[PDB]
Write a protein that holds these residues in place. Structure first.
Motif, mmCIF file in Angstrom:
data_model
loop_
_atom_site.group_PDB
_atom_site.id
_atom_site.type_symbol
_atom_site.label_atom_id
_atom_site.label_comp_id
_atom_site.label_asym_id
_atom_site.label_seq_id
_atom_site.Cartn_x
_atom_site.Cartn_y
_atom_site.Cartn_z
ATOM 1 N N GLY A 121 32.646 31.555 29.449
ATOM 2 C CA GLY A 121 32.379 32.932 29.050
ATOM 3 C C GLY A 121 33.610 33.579 28.443
ATOM 4 N N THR A 122 33.518 34.884 28.187
ATOM 5 C CA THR A 122 34.646 35.663 27.669
ATOM 6 C C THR A 122 35.373 36.289 28.814
ATOM 7 N N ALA A 123 36.691 36.036 28.849
ATOM 8 C CA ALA A 123 37.606 36.591 29.821
ATOM 9 C C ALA A 123 38.595 37.538 29.153
ATOM 10 N N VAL A 124 39.037 38.561 29.886
ATOM 11 C CA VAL A 124 40.197 39.318 29.451
ATOM 12 C C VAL A 124 41.424 38.602 30.027
ATOM 13 N N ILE A 125 42.330 38.174 29.145
ATOM 14 C CA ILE A 125 43.571 37.475 29.487
ATOM 15 C C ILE A 125 44.712 38.166 28.699
ATOM 16 N N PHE A 151 45.830 39.248 44.841
ATOM 17 C CA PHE A 151 45.838 37.946 44.182
ATOM 18 C C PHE A 151 46.731 37.952 42.914
ATOM 19 N N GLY A 152 46.629 39.016 42.133
ATOM 20 C CA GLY A 152 47.413 39.132 40.915
ATOM 21 C C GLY A 152 48.882 39.278 41.201
ATOM 22 N N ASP A 153 49.182 40.144 42.150
ATOM 23 C CA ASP A 153 50.563 40.454 42.489
ATOM 24 C C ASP A 153 51.254 39.327 43.225
ATOM 25 N N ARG A 154 50.468 38.427 43.857
ATOM 26 C CA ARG A 154 51.007 37.254 44.540
ATOM 27 C C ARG A 154 50.702 35.938 43.846
ATOM 28 N N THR A 186 48.186 25.754 41.339
ATOM 29 C CA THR A 186 46.905 26.428 41.542
ATOM 30 C C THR A 186 46.790 27.679 40.652
ATOM 31 N N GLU A 187 45.634 27.827 39.999
ATOM 32 C CA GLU A 187 45.313 29.026 39.211
ATOM 33 C C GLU A 187 44.243 29.868 39.905
ATOM 34 N N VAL A 188 44.134 31.123 39.474
ATOM 35 C CA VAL A 188 43.159 32.092 40.017
ATOM 36 C C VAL A 188 42.389 32.749 38.872
ATOM 37 N N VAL A 189 41.060 32.838 39.016
ATOM 38 C CA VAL A 189 40.191 33.512 38.025
ATOM 39 C C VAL A 189 39.273 34.428 38.805
ATOM 40 N N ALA A 190 39.250 35.708 38.447
ATOM 41 C CA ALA A 190 38.310 36.664 39.025
ATOM 42 C C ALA A 190 37.107 36.853 38.077
ATOM 43 N N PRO A 240 47.606 46.596 34.522
ATOM 44 C CA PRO A 240 47.931 45.255 34.046
ATOM 45 C C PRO A 240 47.725 44.214 35.113
ATOM 46 N N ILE A 241 47.179 43.070 34.719
ATOM 47 C CA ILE A 241 46.899 42.001 35.648
ATOM 48 C C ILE A 241 47.130 40.618 34.982
ATOM 49 N N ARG A 242 47.602 39.666 35.781
ATOM 50 C CA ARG A 242 47.961 38.347 35.265
ATOM 51 C C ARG A 242 46.808 37.353 35.346
#
Lengths: 167, 167, 167, 167, 167, 167, 167, 167, 167, 167
Positions: free
Chosen positions: F15-19, F56-59, F68-72, F96-98
């Motif tokens: 899908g489309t993600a904001v990155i 999750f973003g801040d850590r 390991t990666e994280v996707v919300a 802002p989020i990573r």
């Protein structure tokens, strides 16, 4: 599918028969209280003498004197039966006859009795012995070429009657 | 449901028969090239004399002299058939016999010929005439109390053979 | 499919049995209040001595004295059972027997008990132990060449009776 | 539904067994060329002495000397089987045993053999005798309270082997 | 298929548990009015120390002081559970424990909760949090190699209770 | 129905993600060779601070430093995700989020993961741990009022990685 | 599939709307006794000025002066609608607006009106005119790039109201 | 069921039209390379002036000068269309007209476009804008009482053309 | 169900007809290259003069001189048709006739033409006009009491031939 | 599929006809108590003179004087029928006419009478004679190029009325 099963009530029929030169409605239940020899033959007006129908008619009292009636049936109309009866034996006709000729024009009776030939549109030579309670006791099916015997039919009727009495 | 239809090949059968007091595998196709009178009777070892089977056995040359064989069948095992043959006629047995006694222990043959009685576990009295090309020509079904005639069976075979030749 | 299930009512059966030389109607429910050993065997009148049926009959009091009855069954007719009983043991027969021989001519009982062999038209060697409340407790199925033991059957009955009492 | 049928190949099974205190993969096919006595029991670690398994283990050489093996099965895990084996007999355990204990943890083997009790989650006491060609020869099913006999099992195996060889 | 759905009533269960060394009938409904932590583990008597069950038992009062109970379940029998409990911890056992150990011998509870592994015959590591009204609030499913945390379970239970009361 | 099954490939998604403030196509397979924490949350722009996503973003480096990666993910459009990112945290936004924010506008991803709520049109709080080979290892499903812990998630990832290495 | 048919009652809908910056439950039946212009637009927070929604909002008295209400709808949550309203027009927001913004988060309303785009997860540009007795009178469906006219919408309402009166 | 879907190829049609007073076969594909305004009206020869067809015809160059054609369709036969065209406007006829009148006598075109009224046997007022690649861009369906505007149709055509060019 | 459809090939038929006092096989395709008037009447040997058949026979040259043949059909056997022809008109026969009388003894021709009366077993009065290419051009069905007109039949045939040649 | 069957009630119809230049609702049952000649023709406004309709109109008193009415029907709208009647004969109109022209715009009447041509959207030339009790007595179907005869229609009506009265 045939409904005719030994030891079960004979399949119900009704239709128009020629009886003493007249059209009469006739029904299987008309024969309750009596044994009935109920037989099919292929077609009126063929080029073979109708020897087997003539035999039954000409010997009818050997049945009636033992509480037994006889009915003949083909797929011909009642009009054709009458015309055939009114054609003298010396021209291959049936001549006057004392046995009802039942018409099975719709083919339902023949199909119910398992004697109808789909590819030909008439019956084979089928004979049924039905007791006084309306129960089917005997089935005889002959391929076209071979006729029935009155003497064999009497033997069977007399044996079912003997065994009904001395169980 | 029944596979026996007049003018079609008689339903195939095979099984163990007692022939001349020995077990033999017998097949309908063994009879190709001959007429066959194939008949069913209810049970071995009943309290009624087996008159009809004895009659076909005593008069078997009358069939063989016109290229015709006779086979009898019941639902009884081949072992029961052999014991019934080995029981003298004066003790309620069949005695020595010249007609094969075919066993239809599985009931499949009886069902295929339309003679099996679901509520009783044995056949009614059914007789079939099968020609030399294996085609069924005649079906005779009798309620239990009434037997078959050798004379009538002979007249039918002779008439089918006559009409085969001059048809 | 088989209706015989351990811990459920044994499947109902009724039929004609030979009991002391006479035909009698017999039903499973006739045995309520007693344990029943109910066993099938393949065929009467075979060439092997009926040693297993003889053993149960000849040792019947070892069952009766512990409130247990025995019924033997095959697909043979009641007439065949009777003829077999009337055949002396030293001619290969059963001779006189105290245990009923149930006829399963229709095959329905054998089918209900899961002991019928479709290809052969008879049963395998199946034995069932049914308690006084009509519940099936034990099923033993043997391929044709191997018979049952009276002693093992008694051990089983005695064990079920003991555990019924002191469970 | 049960796939176990006399005279047909015994239903295939495979799983983990405890053999001489070790986990081993075991398959029905591992026993081709030998007779096999394959039996089920309900559960490990109950408060009943496991007399029947001990009897089979104690007398195993009476089977191996006639080319027969023995395998016991329950629905318990292999880990349970091993713990039961490692628990001394006086302490509620099986103790050391020379018969494989097969785990049917998935219940599929018990269902295929028709011994699974759906309301309980374990089997009743079923025993099966399988020949060297993998053909099922004998089914014994006991309600829970009654065990099996080594002597009867030996009699059956010896009879099947004798009739295989001598007819 | 799984019946466990967040915000719907948790699937009903009942069975036999070991509670303080005794067999007891236990039902999901026994816990109405309390939160319940209901978790599955694969098998008793494996070669891994049962750290997670011991941790829950050791810290049980941290649950009871917030009106929460804990129940552990595996597919093992109640008899296995009891033997595992009665086996000292140093000897491969669980030792005494204050958490009920529920048997899912039939596998029906594990299937209803979606934790059963069809190819293995036991569950993966699933944990469920059920409120005082019997509503499922949380599902945690771990592949076999990774255990659960008492601290995380407490955080979840405290958060559900806080949000139930304070929104 | 849900396609997410422990020990099977995690269901494919794209899908489309904001990155980093831009729309990008993102696929599950983009993460092969790394562990992935993939989690759903209900809705952007609600009145509760998005504390769990912020954590999750801040850590994020505590995940990235262990491969390991994280996707919300939520059902919100990519346009809504972007507007939420561009809303300062002290006005209730994400800021802002990573971590990528995946849009599941069609609901197909949510349905594939078994986290979609039909009556509400958004997800519950579902979290999935997927290994470097794409296999699903862990499923965590929370009812709406209760969030996830970064610390518990790290414990799980570290445990799966440890057991992958030294299993 | 679509339930919107001209001359039939417009498909029932209900959901949460933002009205005067507050969440309100809104139902189609709330509008009985008035004409209703009910229209769909794809997504909040896109990079295109919401000209068409602004136009209906600026000219709303022209509808209200002829007993007509206007409702706009997208698949966005009520939370997203409220955030878009609260975002000033010069920052890509909608700004204060006088038309309710209905959320179709479940997508059921869009599907019922035949405007949902399965591959995209949002609606095309659809507009419906519903009379005061709740009957659908007009359907206008536009591919995404093209907007609606207030003048045209006004001409249709006025013409339906004229023909209602003088019909 | 209607085949007409926005963004999919417009459903294929062919039939007889009246074009410059003559019968010509006409097909949707004849319009490839051009925009097409394709519209249905109920019936020829009613008592209302055909204002909306006259408007399209009389303003036809505002379409043709922007690479757009117009076709009108009803369920009337081509003979009725011709007779109507040959009826002067001052007698309520159409008079000479430069737009094809397509006959949909079989009703297949109307059903394919979703504009057929089963109970009445004619169409409602449906208008379709089809692009030069044959893709359906716009659907407008009006209840019987209310006509279409040429000015609105031009606005839509010009906007699809602008957006095709400046994507 | 009827296969007879205007502008489609007339349903194929074949059977035995009486032609000039002899049995001949006849089929529909024997008439390819000529027009055929094919008509059914109820029954031979009824008490009403066969006026319509006599009329077609008498005027047969008016058909033949325009490349047209005439065939009559009833459900009666061929033997009955022959007997009816060989019966003088003065005794309710048909007498000599130049038109083929086709037998539909199986009723399959009548059913295929939609003229069969299931309750009666014969046809109504149906007449069919078939062109030289075998295509059905005209169907006339009369209830039983009303006959056909040679003059109307000739008008129709001539008009079909006229319109075939002159468009 | 056709509902029109000789000797059964003629299929019910209703619709709008033009009668003496006005629209009137008309139904089959309006003619109960009278004979009805009901006939269909293909289309209004074609290039062939409407000779057959004019003939029935001109000779209508020959029907009315024998208690018989005449109704003509095509698939054209009522508006088209009226326009065709209001077009002088000299310009290919029908002119004034005394027979009702029924509209079958929905095609349901045509389908019910078996006269509809699916490929064309209009009927062939069918004519039906319905008695005063509403029973269908006669069906005439002509391929398109051949018309009906008033004289043959009158012969039929008179013969049905004659046979109704005199048996």
């Amino acid at each position: 599918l045939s409904k005719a099963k030994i030891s079960k009530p004979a399949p119900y029929w009704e239709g128009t028969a020629v009886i003493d030169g007249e059209f009469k409605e006739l029904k299987l239940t008309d024969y309750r209280g009596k044994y009935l020899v109920f037989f099919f033959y292929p077609l009126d007006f063929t080029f073979v003498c109708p020897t087997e129908i003539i035999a039954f008619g000409d010997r009818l009292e050997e049945f009636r004197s033992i509480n037994t009636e006889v009915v003949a049936c083909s797929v011909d109309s009642q009009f054709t039966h009458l015309a055939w009866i009114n054609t003298p034996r010396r021209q291959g006709g049936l001549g006057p006859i004392r046995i009802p000729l039942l018409s099975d024009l719709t083919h339902q009776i023949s199909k119910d009795y398992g004697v109808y030939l789909e590819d030909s549109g008439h019956t084979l030579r089928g004979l049924f012995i039905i007791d006084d309670k309306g129960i089917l006791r005997q089935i005889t099916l002959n391929d076209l070429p071979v006729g029935r015997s009155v003497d064999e039919t009497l033997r069977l009727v007399q044996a079912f009657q003997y065994t009904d009495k001395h169980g």
